[PDB]
Amino acid sequence: DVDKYTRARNAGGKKAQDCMLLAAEGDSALSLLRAGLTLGKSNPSGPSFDFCGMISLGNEQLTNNKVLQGIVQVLGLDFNCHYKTQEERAKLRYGCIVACVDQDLDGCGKILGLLLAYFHLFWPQLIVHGFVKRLLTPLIRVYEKGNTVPVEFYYEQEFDAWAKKQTSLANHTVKYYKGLAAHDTHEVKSMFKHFDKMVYTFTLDDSAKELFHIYFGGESELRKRELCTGVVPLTETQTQSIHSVRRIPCSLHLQVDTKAYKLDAIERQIPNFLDGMTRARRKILAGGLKCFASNNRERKVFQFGGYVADHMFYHHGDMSLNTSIIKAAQYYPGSSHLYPVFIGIGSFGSRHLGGKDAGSPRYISVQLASEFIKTMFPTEDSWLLPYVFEDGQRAEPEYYVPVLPLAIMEYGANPSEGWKYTTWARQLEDILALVRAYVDKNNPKHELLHYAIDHKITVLPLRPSNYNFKGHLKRFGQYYYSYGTYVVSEQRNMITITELPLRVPTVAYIESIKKSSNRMAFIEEIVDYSSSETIEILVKLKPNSLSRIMEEFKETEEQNSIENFLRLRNCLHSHLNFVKPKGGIIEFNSYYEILYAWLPYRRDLYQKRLMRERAVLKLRLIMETAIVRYINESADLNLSHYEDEKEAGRILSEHGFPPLNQSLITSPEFATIEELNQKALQGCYTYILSLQARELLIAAKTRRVEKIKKMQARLDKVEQLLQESPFPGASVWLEEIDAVEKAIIKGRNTQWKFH
Amino acid sequence: DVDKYTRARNAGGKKAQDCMLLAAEGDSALSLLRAGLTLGKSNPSGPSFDFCGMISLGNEQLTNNKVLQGIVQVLGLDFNCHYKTQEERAKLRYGCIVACVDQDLDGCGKILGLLLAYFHLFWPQLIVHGFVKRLLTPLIRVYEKGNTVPVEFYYEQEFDAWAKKQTSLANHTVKYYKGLAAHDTHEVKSMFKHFDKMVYTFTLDDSAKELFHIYFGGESELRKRELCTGVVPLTETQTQSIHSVRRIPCSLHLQVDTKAYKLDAIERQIPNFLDGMTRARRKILAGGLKCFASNNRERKVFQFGGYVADHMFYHHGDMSLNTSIIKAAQYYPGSSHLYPVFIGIGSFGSRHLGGKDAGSPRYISVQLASEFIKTMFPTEDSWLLPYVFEDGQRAEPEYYVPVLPLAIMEYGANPSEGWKYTTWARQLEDILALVRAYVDKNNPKHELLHYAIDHKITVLPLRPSNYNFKGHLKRFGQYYYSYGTYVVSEQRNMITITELPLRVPTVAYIESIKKSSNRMAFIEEIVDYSSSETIEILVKLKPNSLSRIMEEFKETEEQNSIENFLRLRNCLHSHLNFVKPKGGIIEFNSYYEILYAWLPYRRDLYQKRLMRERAVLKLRLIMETAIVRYINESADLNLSHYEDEKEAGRILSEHGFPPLNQSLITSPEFATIEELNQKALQGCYTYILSLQARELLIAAKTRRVEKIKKMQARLDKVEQLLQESPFPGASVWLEEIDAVEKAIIKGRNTQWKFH
């Protein structure tokens, strides 16, 4: 077999039942297992090569794979045995096979799930009676400073419960070990001390079998139904039951690990319907917001990609990161981004190659479209979004909620086969009219739009956008078609294609025309004299070929003879599969329902921002009233730093000064509403104990009083902003819509350069 | 026919001589050319498709090259015919061919030099009289915010000469355009407005055929000899002549750009002999120092690579960066780095796979040593090294000069074949003794070693290091051999290998043994029961077979029969090829030559560092004395901060108060001695006007006088530290050597973990 197999000393012998075969995922896991097994030979008594062999991993096609062939060869497994009896199972060369895989979505999920599916399909009785086992390593380890002994959790839920049970984590360092290679040598020896406690068994409950037909079977219909609901994390009772007897039911593993892996794989191609961007593009947008927040100077594409990888935890390949950055910065007729989030200083590609003619990342530079991004992705709303956490560190948000539905007003296609997704940008005017009717409460269609929302029918048009399109858009039999424009000169027997169909690359169109032999039977030659953004394809035909073209290619009342011959028609087939914000997959059938689903999320975000702003304003005015009421009697109490700052708190508590938490009321970063109003109090008097002498003079007092009157006016303004007729925060939504419309118009005027 | 050829309207007709062909390397340059050529009604009478065609640049092999075949087909060139006469030169379909290429050692030199060599080899008469032309786009553009028209320099020397005057850059922005894709649309149209004057014609002067043969011919000895001197940039006179006549000689073009490209390609594999690291490794070290100069917290490999790319201008791929980071963080018996610059938390590989079994960059984390680096690479000297400026921004230094020569005490190899380079680490004790004898001046061999370095003979041993090696290092006459250790038991017929030769991967060695069919005629089986760091490989042989190995593999007075059978000897072949600090390539016959070459550079760096320290200490001393005198007798003129206008400057210049550059003196980053002393007295009086009230009484005067006393003591310590008998700064070098030896000992004791 392969040389990756390290045989145990007693493997296949009289004591083969006591032997176990560790199946590491890759070379790093193999090296870790080797190091642990060899260090166990000297200090402890336990695992070693005497009773532990090592191997590495690498239906109709699952039987010819070399790795499974090697595994079945070493284990001595017989296909036609079914291992029902104990003596039949005793003939195996190893007592059990232990899978040692990384805790991430690659090791657990895809590979562990694949091994479990293979075993269940071929030898289902092996999973029962406890033959297939796994290695459960500490997923999270928290180290207390000056304690040199960590506390370990095998699941994120246990760590979250312990953390919320804890008072503070100032002196605790949390390390996430998603992969086996992340364990240090001392950590590895700590695991191999009680290696016997890290072996978990699979039970193969009744519900597992059907699941094995869903995630890994050839049935691709019920798989989508299973995937369209998101992954539910394991509950605490299930984890406790698993840890009690060290047995993991297969069902739970299939429903959690493999399902999360499949969802992650889908999310890398299909974007969320709230912002129209995938996880990688969300990371890029967040990194651009973080980098150009205060500087906004042009940076090289590779430099910005390095910044994104450093700060936004983009652990994928840098070539994909650079390609996605270029795609986000591309702006041309037929581009995938109608409103790009980045301004591209340099040659970022043209419509002829479909954006593939972009310059190298080391030459072209990128900048943040500050005006458009700020008007569409407000900085205030960024705090209230739910964020993803990579190894306990903040990263890009789970989803962005722009002022207008970005998943609709921009083009989008998935080139990777496996899941169909195609979106054609709708007209900006129609989107603006629809949202303004929904929010304005003064539009005559506002009540009609609400009627259309509660019961699903269409009341306002939603036509495909034709901003950078010089052709025609014809709706025939519920299908939209884009037609390019051409001219014919009979005297020179020549045709000049002036406009290709929507999102059709020039070189791709030319090669498609050239491939068809029948088309070339009349075309003498083709050249491409098109400009950087316009289309001018010069085709010269053979003599007396126009009549032959007319008689051969026939008009179908939709496209004339020339358009059919020149392939100047495109069908706007759109696949509206999107990723739910909670994790699931949702398949729409029209853009109207996409907009109807996006509206409540934006409305709820506006309401949440309004309540958070109201609470923050109340807290700020409370602390300002406290500081001014200390100021006007500073000649009565006279204690800021005159005495020791430990006896002051008694006298400030004897008077009416509530404890407050500075740096939380002064600048709440991500303080959620209930936590913000809970932990704002029970702080300390640093807002009074640690003030400066600058506040002593009356000018500071009058500045404070004008500030407090300003925030009182703002508080009443946001209070009347609430309980509005359509919903709280509708007027501010209308103002943001107007601002983003102005920004879009300005960008369109200056070719998305903004001077 | 040709895939990416856009024919001109008049090409191949009565105006062929007026038609020119633009050759582009990639699709980005083609898109730029298409955008420039299609300015209709804007930039009139400029280039267009009427007289400009386009083509893309996608010794028997040169004949069948598809790109060159397309080019010759387009131009109608004839291989047999020599275009020496004007009448036969008019048969070409284009008047001239223009190369529109980048200016970053790839567009220029690599493929432009290739095109020039092709034309010279096949049609040398074409280059003369003018046929091959190039597009010299503005390399550097200086924009003034109040002028909105840039100043363009086509060479870096011109920009440097301009920057010699116009010193302030008070309101100027410098932009570097190394590639064609870096130009913006307005820049593109401005360039195409003068496209007629942007073209430069090659001349093929004398002494260029020999240069062409050297750089592109099959001969390599003279090509290597050319590369031992480095690239010399064009002088002002040559650039002025080129710009005045708009003709570029081929020789100058070659020696300027293709030599630089070849040197850059070489130095990406061959490291410098001063620090023992290539450009990528030096960038990694500088980025690590920048990242962990303050925190030293462990970071993921991919995050650190992103930081390095963002800050150190590492524009290459991220996989190479991650691999190099892992290699720099690897520490195991046989690893390349005996003293790694990085502490790696996780599994970074093992000796078995030669470091190729490391975990993914997502999981394993890296951090700076912060204890060995601070001693081997002092932070004081980091301000004195020459620095590499990429696109006008600072980057990793030109070369590092460590306290001990790292190119001689670390294993090095070149995985990229094309330039042999192999280094075997010398013993640390021998190197320390040699350097101490050279420096301490008290060693009995000090003057003897000076005589030795003067007469290039060897007087102190330099033996290969055997720190992490349990074998034997034996010298058999002008070569060294490493022998592994084995134990063989005749009973039960097993041979257990306990130590492999130096830098021999375990799995590679096992595979090499396995491929030898004759050796497995006796080997029953091979098992790899080795540990993580020590090797224990079991080889079970066939019964009564040891005598067969005795009679088959014969003793050669160097290898035992078992050693020859198991290939337990390795020859320590050395290839002492390095790159000169100025750019050239140097070859050494022994490690003694490397040490003797590295010593003067380090001695001169100590002298320069001490000189700069003395100068900056004198500057600080005069500024402190000035401020002390001001705080002493300010009552005479004025004691307040109200004098912040020019009146204070005038009243201070009336007395003996010199104007000093406070910012430069208080923190000179890279100010060398000459302009340090030139700009010291060209500052302002801010060193006095920036005195807070705290510093306006005696309580700060005592601190000031204590500071001046301490720095005066440091000043005369530097003073008599100089003029030492061996060289100035000998004791500082000795104590730095002791500190670095202590750090190395601590790292070796802690397995390069430092707890």
Residue numbers in the entry:
A (entry chain B), B (entry chain A): 414 to 471, 496 to 1192
What do the paper's sentences say?
To capture the intact structure of full-length pP1192R, the protein sample was then analyzed by single-particle cryo-EM. After collecting and processing 2134 cryo-EM images, two types of particles, referred to as State 1 and State 2, were identified and reconstructed to the overall resolution of 2.77 and 2.98 Å with 131 161 and 78 195 particles, respectively. The electron density was only observable for the DNA binding/cleavage domain in both states, while the electron density of the N-terminal ATPase domain was absent. Following the process of atomic model building based on the EM density map, the apo structure of the pP1192R DNA binding/cleavage domain was well resolved in both states, with the C-terminus of the protein (C-gate) adopting distinct conformations, accordingly described as ‘open’ (State 1) and ‘closed’ (State 2). These apo structures can be traced for 779 residues, ranging from D416 to H1192, except for the region containing residues G471-N501. The other typical domains of the DNA binding/cleavage core characterized in Topo IIAs, that is, the metal-binding topoisomerase/primase (TOPRIM) domain, the catalytic tyrosine (Y800 in pP1192R)-containing winged helix domain (WHD), the Tower domain, and the coiled-coil helices, are well illustrated in the two pP1192R apo structures. In the closed state, an extra dimeric interface, the C-gate, was formed by the interaction between the coiled-coil helices of two protomers, which retains a distance of ∼16 Å in the open state. No significant conformational changes were observed in the DNA-binding groove when comparing the two apo states, while the coiled-coil helices underwent a distinct conformational rearrangement, presenting the dynamic cycling of the C-gate between open to closed. The coiled-coil regions (from A' α14 to A' α18) of each protomer move towards one another in the closed state, with the furthest end moving a distance of ∼13.4 Å and a reorientation of ∼12° relative to the open state.
The African swine fever virus (ASFV) type II topoisomerase (Topo II), pP1192R, is the only known Topo II expressed by mammalian viruses and is essential for ASFV replication in the host cytoplasm. In ASFV, a functional viral Topo II pP1192R has been identified, encoded by a viral gene conserved in ASFV strains, P1192R. pP1192R is detectable at an intermediate to late stage of ASFV infection, mainly within the cytoplasmic virus factory, and has been confirmed to be important for ASFV replication. Topo IIAs exhibit a 2-fold symmetry and comprise two functional domains: an ATPase domain and a DNA binding/cleavage domain. The mechanism of enzymatic action involves the opening and closing of three gate-like dimeric interfaces, which are called the N-, DNA- and C-gate, respectively, upon ATP binding and hydrolysis and DNA cleavage that introduces a double-strand break in the DNA (G-segment) trapped in the DNA-gate for transport of another DNA strand (T-segment).
